[PDB]
């Protein structure tokens, strides 16, 4: 927990954050979930699937 | 801080230059022993030729640039032999000043050059006088002080450690440690 | 190995913003929150942080000490491997009013 091999030394935003449309978010989610599904990461994908589900349907 | 840099010069901890070359020839003292023992090296030609394996080096070095220059400096040196040091030619400076000893076969100290050439003249003896010259040129190349070597500490240790042997009194001029302190 | 590794090698917290080992401290967290290394020098007293329009602190910038005082900032802290005598030296030099600034990379 909070070590050099666990967390990075520094994180810096190289540019200002650019907003993305509902369709771009959904296109990214589908691309990310498919690539990661292909150990504790599984629980995060489980939560990510709920966001993707909300951006097009109802829970 | 004083050590050998990758550019063969003797530099201090802060990068300030102390010497342009170690003793003016860049030779490691722990190697400069049989480097003048030419008869020894000749009797062990094939043994040393196998030691200083040149087959894996011939593609990484230059075999003529320094050797040609060495003749040009020897030419002007012989011209002003009887002439004094202040009247000597300053046209061509030493081969070590112009060519890296670890990259050019022949960029050897003029002291080594004079000693090696004198041996080949005074001793006419299946080893040719030309192939032996190359082996000794290669031996000098392999006798160079390694970049990073702490020549500073080594020097003070080389003056300090034997100055313990001169703690005893005289058996007019100041001697031993008091003179060294002066 | 002799003069550091097998003597007084200590992985110590340092603030990249002011370059010091003595101002850094572990923050006191709430029941659910986690403790974070924070710099006492670079951090501002919560009440003193006053205000174009009003700005809001991102929550992750507010830390609390054992005395219960809230602070804003002083989160640009990292870890460096140093001899412990350095920490004692810096401490002694600080008594004399002398400040050592350790420039730490990456920034």
């Amino acid at each position: 927990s909070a070590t050099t091999l666990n967390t990075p030394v520094v994180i810096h935003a190289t540019q200002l954050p650019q907003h993305v449309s509902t369709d771009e978010v959904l296109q990214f989610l589908e691309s990310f979930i498919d690539e990661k599904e292909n150990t504790n990461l599984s629980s995060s994908i489980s939560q990510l699937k709920r966001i993707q589900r909300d951006f097009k349907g109802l829970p | 801080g004083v050590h050998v840099s990758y550019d063969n010069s003797i530099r201090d901890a802060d990068g300030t230059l102390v010497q342009f070359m170690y003793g003016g020839d860049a030779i490691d003292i722990t190697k400069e022993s049989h480097m003048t023992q030419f008869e020894f090296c000749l009797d062990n030609y094939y043994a040393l030729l196998k030691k200083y394996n040149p087959s894996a080096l011939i593609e990484h070095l230059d075999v003529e640039s320094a050797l040609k220059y060495s003749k040009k400096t020897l030419k002007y040196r012989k011209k002003h032999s009887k002439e004094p040091h202040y009247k000597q030619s300053v046209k061509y400076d030493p081969v070590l000043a112009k060519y890296n000893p670890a990259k050019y076969l022949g960029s050897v100290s003029e002291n080594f050059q004079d000693k090696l050439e004198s041996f080949l003249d005074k001793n006419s003896k299946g080893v040719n006088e030309k192939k032996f010259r190359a082996l000794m040129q290669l031996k000098y190349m392999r006798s160079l002080i390694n970049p990073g070597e702490a020549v500073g500490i080594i020097a003070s240790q080389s003056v300090g450690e034997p100055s313990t042997q001169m703690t005893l009194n005289t058996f007019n001029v100041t001697l031993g440690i008091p003179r060294l302190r002066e | 190995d002799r003069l550091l590794n097998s003597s007084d090698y200590t992985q110590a917290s340092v603030c990249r913003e002011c370059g010091s080992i003595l101002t850094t401290q572990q923050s006191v967290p709430r029941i659910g929150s986690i403790s974070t290394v924070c710099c006492r020098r670079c951090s501002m007293r919560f009440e003193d942080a006053k205000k174009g329009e009003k700005i809001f602190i991102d929550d992750s910038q507010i830390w609390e000490d054992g005395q219960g005082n809230k602070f804003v900032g002083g989160n640009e802290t990292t870890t460096v491997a140093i001899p412990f005598v350095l920490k004692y030296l810096d401490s002694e030099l600080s008594a004399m009013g002398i400040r050592l600034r350790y420039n730490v990379e990456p920034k």
Binding site: - | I154, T164 | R2, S13, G19, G66, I82, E92, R99, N103
Partner: protein, 614 residues
């Protein structure tokens, strides 16, 4: 040092500066006001040197970071000085600037054009350009102000151009070039500047004389009254003032004189106090030479020394308590001063009370920093300067040299049956000296046995380090637990935060290990070589071969040798390929051998190689 614990950040450079009073007040964990250290019953008194805000003390948790005595790093505090004090280390300097300044126009008594000449030369020297600093002296046109201001303009023009020209090329960076020769030229100028500054008697700007300042051994300044020739000089130059619109001197008066002088002469002092250009653009203030506060180091560095049963008070706390008593006393004197006043006339007493208050706190401040600057008390307590220079000094005794872990000492005994590159290690040392060997697929078999063997059977293991960072001692455990832990060495890490890591086994020193053999005095690097460990059973002494006798200059007349056991592979490789014995056959002094056989072997050889020997 742990290879499982890498560090991503590193210190590239250290900057030397002075702590400001405003800076200390903000970082401070608690204000120290009480001279007592403990309340009744045994708890630390609030506002005292042992306050829990300065860190965990007496099985209590820290009141700043909340951690216990082990994990708490300790926290800095501060003492509020009721009156400013001269910082002992910088007194000599503030004294130089006090004697060098005019008490009327509040400029240095040296002519402005001459001062600017030094500022110019010192600015050009912030960058590596000495030739240009000398070329400035060539710039030349009782002299009118319109003419002298043109000289200052032409000189400033050359300085700005010479910097920009050298900055365009690779001659100097924005941070400025700094060499030893550059440093030599700077040191020469800063000396010459102070020499010219102190030499002037009558101020070159306004022709009025200033009263000379004298000093004693302790930090205290006096003002010598002007002579009748100089008093009449003040009168005749008194009218020109209107058209434009021995006695002790207090610390406040000196600070106030230097305050205006450091403002009015800021341009030169900017380069006098900065070795390289001042990119931070910080103002050079006089209050850097003065102390309005004192930092209280953490309780961690002021713990009471325990010798057996007796628990002795820390000497720093004693000196700090003295500063606290005087501060409370001056707070009362200033409170009584605030009360009353209509009745005055005899003001020789109120100044006498003030002089005592100032000289007493100053002495207490001095006693804490540098004892050899404090008054004699009927051996004194050492100051922080004395702490850094106790004998050889903190730098020599605890930085350049250190006592080390994983090392042993023993009388050396001769041995011709071990290799010339080996050392005979007694089994006593072999069962105590361990190496942190990370468990892998290629060495799981070797380490499992070591774990089973334990800390008393060689080749064994004293401890096992898990991938979570924790340690499991094998010392108290029986063969049953050790067998169970050995079958748990190559188990995969469940935690994703430590999957990168693998367990470590703190295994006994084996016969494949490197050791650093040392025989003092270490007059040359051959007296510290790398030897191959050879554990010899039923031994109580370090066994050494006769070939090593020369290099160490060690005779087996009851001599002692130090054995160092490096704890990582980079240190191993170095002791096996660079500092190893075999690579030390020839000394670098003359390139001659320092290794060979000594007595029996020489006599044996003359007989063995003889013609008669068949």
């Amino acid at each position: 040092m742990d290879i499982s614990k890498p560090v991503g950040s590193e210190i590239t450079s250290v900057d030397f500066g002075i702590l400001t009073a405003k800076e200390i007040r903000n970082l401070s964990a608690k204000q120290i006001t009480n001279p007592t250290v403990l309340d009744n019953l045994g708890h630390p008194v609030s506002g005292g040197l042992y306050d829990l805000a300065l860190g965990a003390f007496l099985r209590n948790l820290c009141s700043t970071c909340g951690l216990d005595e082990k994990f708490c790093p300790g926290h800095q505090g501060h003492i509020e000085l009721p009156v400013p004090c001269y910082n002992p280390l910088f007194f000599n300097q503030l004294y130089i600037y006090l004697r060098a300044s005019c008490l009327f126009c509040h400029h240095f008594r040296l002519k402005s054009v001459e001062v600017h000449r030094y500022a110019c030369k010192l600015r050009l020297l912030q960058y590596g350009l000495i030739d240009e600093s000398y070329k400035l002296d060539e710039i030349t046109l009782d002299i009118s102000s319109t003419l002298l201001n043109e000289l200052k303009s032409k000189r400033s023009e050359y300085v700005d151009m010479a910097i920009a020209k050298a900055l365009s090329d690779g001659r100097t960076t924005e941070r400025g070039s700094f060499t030893a020769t550059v440093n030599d030229e700077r040191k020469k100028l800063v000396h010459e500047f102070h020499k010219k500054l102190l030499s002037r008697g009558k101020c070159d700007n306004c022709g009025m004389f200033s009263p000379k300042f004298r000093k004693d051994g302790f930090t205290k300044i006096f003002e010598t009254a002007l002579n009748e020739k100089q008093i009449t000089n003040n009168r005749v130059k008194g009218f020109i003032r209107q058209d434009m619109i021995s006695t002790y001197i207090l610390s406040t008066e000196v600070k106030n004189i230097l305050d205006t002088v450091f403002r009015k002469e800021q341009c030169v002092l900017q380069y006098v106090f900065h070795s390289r250009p001042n990119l931070s653009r910080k103002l050079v203030k006089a209050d850097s030479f003065f102390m309005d506060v004192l930092v209280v180091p953490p309780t961690r560095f002021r713990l009471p020394s325990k010798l057996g049963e007796e628990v002795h008070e820390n000497s720093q706390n004693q000196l700090l308590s003295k500063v606290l008593t005087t501060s409370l006393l001056i707070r009362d004197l200033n409170d009584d001063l605030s009360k009353l006043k209509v009745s005055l006339e005899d003001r020789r007493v109120i100044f006498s009370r003030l002089m005592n208050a100032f000289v007493t706190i100053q002495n207490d401040v001095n006693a804490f920093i540098d004892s050899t600057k404090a008054q004699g008390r009927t051996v004194p307590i050492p100051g922080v300067k004395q702490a850094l220079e106790k004998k050889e000094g903190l730098f020599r005794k605890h930085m350049m040299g250190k006592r080390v872990n994983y090392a042993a000492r023993s009388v050396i005994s001769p041995d011709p049956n071990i290799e010339t590159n080996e050392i005979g290690v007694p089994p006593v040392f072999a069962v105590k000296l361990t190496y942190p060997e990370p468990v892998t697929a290629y060495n799981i078999a070797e380490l499992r046995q070591a774990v089973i063997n334990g800390p008393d059977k060689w080749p064994g293991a004293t401890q096992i380090q898990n991938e979570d960072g924790s340690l499991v001692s094998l010392i108290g455990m029986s063969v049953e637990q050790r067998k169970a832990l050995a079958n748990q060495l190559l188990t995969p890490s469940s935690n994703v935060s430590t999957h990168t890591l693998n367990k470590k086994v703190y295994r006994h020193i084996k016969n494949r290990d490197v050791v650093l053999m040392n025989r003092q005095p270490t007059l040359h690097k051959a007296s510290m070589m790398g030897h191959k460990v050879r554990v010899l059973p039923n031994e109580k002494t370090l066994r050494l071969h006769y070939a090593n006798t020369g290099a160490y200059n060690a005779d087996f007349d009851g001599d002692e040798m130090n054995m160092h056991f490096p704890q990582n592979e980079n240190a191993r490789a170095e002791a096996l390929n660079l500092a190893n014995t075999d690579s030390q056959y020839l000394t670098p002094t003359s390139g001659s051998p320092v290794r060979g056989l000594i007595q029996d072997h020489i006599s044996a050889g003359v007989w063995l190689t003889s013609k008669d020997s068949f």
